[PDB]
């Protein structure tokens with residue numbers, strides 16, 4: 001029995017490991033450049049801004065920070081995905097149990113513990129913005145600690161689903177973070193970890209086109225830093241016609 | 254019917270698109286830094302060098318170049334993977350037909366056509382090192398052209414499996430390239446696209462550990478640039494015990 005190809009890739013391969021280390025190398029160099037030369041804009045979009053003409057919450061004199069998604073961005077949910085592979089199960093009740101009892105089965109995303117330590121040695125505050133539930137803040141704090149990612153504090157450096165009434169939408173929390181910090185880098189494994197504009201409607205092919213809108217494309221590896229996730233979530237959608245465009249079809253002999 | 258999760262991710266998602274654009278943004282900035290300040294070492298390992306103490310073919314006065322894997326690094330093999338998803342088939346005869354007849358069903362990896370044009374505008378020679386077969390050089394040249402990747406020439410900027418007697422091992426071709434160019438960046442989707450030392454023996458867990466050997470880890474996003482591939486190849490290996498380590502297991506209630 002072998003696990004699903006996506007988990008073999010994400011959890012088992014050196015390919016995925018190298019991909020993640022590249023992401024954090026680029027982030028560390030970017031942060032270091034902006035620690036020496038503070039920017040005028042943060043990397044968080046302003047309220048009402050669109051992807052075509054992005055405007056950003058200004059950096060100002062606010063303390064420097066970096067924002068991170070938690071799950072499959074800085075922390076691997078190994079125990080949970082093991083159970084999903086064993087069971088074949090989108091199990092919301094199981095995920096709730098996992099938020100409460102998974103602190104002993106998490107690992108850092110390759111390079112994320114070293115990157116988080118370097119950021120703090122540079123004087124940059126490490127802020128987590130995750131859709132784990134607010135009522136599970138304390139076990140989530142302990143899991144973050146167990147992955148070697150340091151100390152997170154609910155409401156100061158850790159923001160969770162249910163901290164506002166926006167549900168899985170993260171823009172509201174992003175606005176709260178950007179109102180007190182100059183956010184000079186932002187990491188995630190899902191497009192919703194950078195803007196809610198990618199979700200809540202857009203099709204699979206529309207979301208992929210939107211990442212190549214030039215004013216948005218310039219962010220990738222240059223303020224917005226992406227970690228791989230072919231195991232669950234927004235990337236795992238679309239029928240044959242959205243995945244394989246009709247001008248690129250072919251059949252073997 | 255939906256395609257395999259890995260193909261939904263790689264071919265359909267904006268997540269994979271953003272991940273690829275980040276890789277090429279980091280590569281472009283790296284190349285530009287080295288065009289201004291030529292390095293002493295290339296990014297290609299010297300003969301007999303090990304991953305723990307890497308030595309590199311020197312840059313010297315040789316003309317500047319960047320080396321790229323072709324398949325799923327700069328070119329998406331959309332037609333072929335469509336057929337694999339339709340058919341469920343590791344089909345070596347089908348892949349041979351595809352090398353010969355697939356030029357009309359390929360697309361650039363997101364950002365790869367723009368990156369290849371920028372490299373040439375910077376005066377950097379774009380060299381391809383692929384395990385497509387030497388006897389299919391001409392259709393491979395045409396497919397590279399159709400993906401918007403420019404003009405490749407067998408034996409000058411394009412090196413193929415069978416150009417030497419080493420089979421799928423790419424070190425021999427890497428040595429030939431590094432003997433005439435100063436290779437300042439190298440891109441790939443498989444660890445064999447950077448060194449043969451990752452393959453031919455090492456286990457799934459050994460290969461992943463090897464990417465974090467510190468002298469090697471420093472390469473990722475800093476000379477060695479990685480593109481995602483959870484669809485086929487070296488990343489899709491390993492049983493449950495290699496993918497989900499035994500100190501990170503968990504079971505739902």
Ligand SMILES: [Mg+2]
Pocket residue numbers: 069070071072073189190
């Ligand atoms: Mg996540």
Ligand SMILES: [Mg+2]
Pocket residue numbers: 322323324325326442443
């Ligand atoms: Mg390849």
